[PDB]
């Protein structure tokens, strides 16, 4: 079984911090990691992600638990768990950095997942993540410059 002392600590802390409505779902999630059933574990996390009972738990989940197997499962799944928790968290620059850095982990894994010149996948998930964090960076643009450069009116930078 894959269940171990760190994960027993995590499951206990999660179950303590969690709203009781999450417990039936977390019983199957617990057993799925114990059985190393990464895909059913991901569907359980997807059912949790479709709800908001305890969204900040997904930050612990990404940082300490999904980190054990994040390469075994869909990129957008793991990054979305970090999206919901770190978007609800009262920051945005940390969110920008963290989601780009998690994209960068997949950018390094890309060749190990397997690749060819424009293979069937060549970073499609991380292109979406890059577009999502670019949308975040645009939403947090410093100034809408002026109509002087209406087409690309960001002022996040200009030189250096």
The method recorded for this entry reads NMR
Where exactly are the structural domains of the chain?
Answer: 1-140
Please give the C-alpha separations between residue 21 and each of 11, 60, 124, 125, in angstroms, as whole numbers: 15, 19, 35, 31
What whole-number distance in Å separates Cα of residue 159 and Cα of residue 40? 48
What whole-number distance in Å separates Cα of residue 141 and Cα of residue 20? 40
Token couple for 108? 């390094």
CB 65 within 8 A of CB 7: yes
Please give the C-alpha separations between residue 42 and each of 27, 37, 62, 108, in angstroms, as whole numbers: 14, 9, 12, 22
Sign of CA dihedral 139, 145, 150, 154: negative
The dihedrals phi and psi of 56, each to the nearest 5 degrees, come to: -50, -25
What whole-number distance in Å separates Cα of residue 36 and Cα of residue 50? 22
Neighbours of 27 (CB within 10 A): 13
CB 25 within 8 A of CB 33: no
């Amino acid at each position: 079984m894959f269940n171990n002392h760190e994960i027993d600590t995590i499951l206990s802390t999660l179950r303590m911090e969690a709203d009781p409505s999450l417990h039936p779902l977390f019983e199957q999630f617990e057993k799925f990691y114990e059985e190393k059933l990464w895909f059913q574990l991901s569907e359980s996390l997807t059912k949790f992600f479709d709800d908001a009972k305890s969204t900040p738990l997904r930050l612990r989940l990404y940082d300490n638990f999904v980190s054990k197997f994040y390469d075994k499962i869909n990129q957008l799944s793991v990054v979305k768990y970090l999206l919901a928790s770190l978007k609800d968290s009262k920051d945005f620059d940390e969110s920008l950095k963290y989601l780009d850095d998690l994209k960068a982990q997949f950018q390094e894994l890309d060749s190990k997942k397997q690749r060819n010149n424009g293979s069937k996948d060549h970073g499609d998930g991380i292109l979406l993540i890059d577009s999502e964090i670019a949308r975040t960076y645009l939403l947090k643009n410093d100034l809408v410059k002026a109509r002087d450069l209406l087409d690309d009116l960001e002022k996040t930078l200009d030189k250096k």
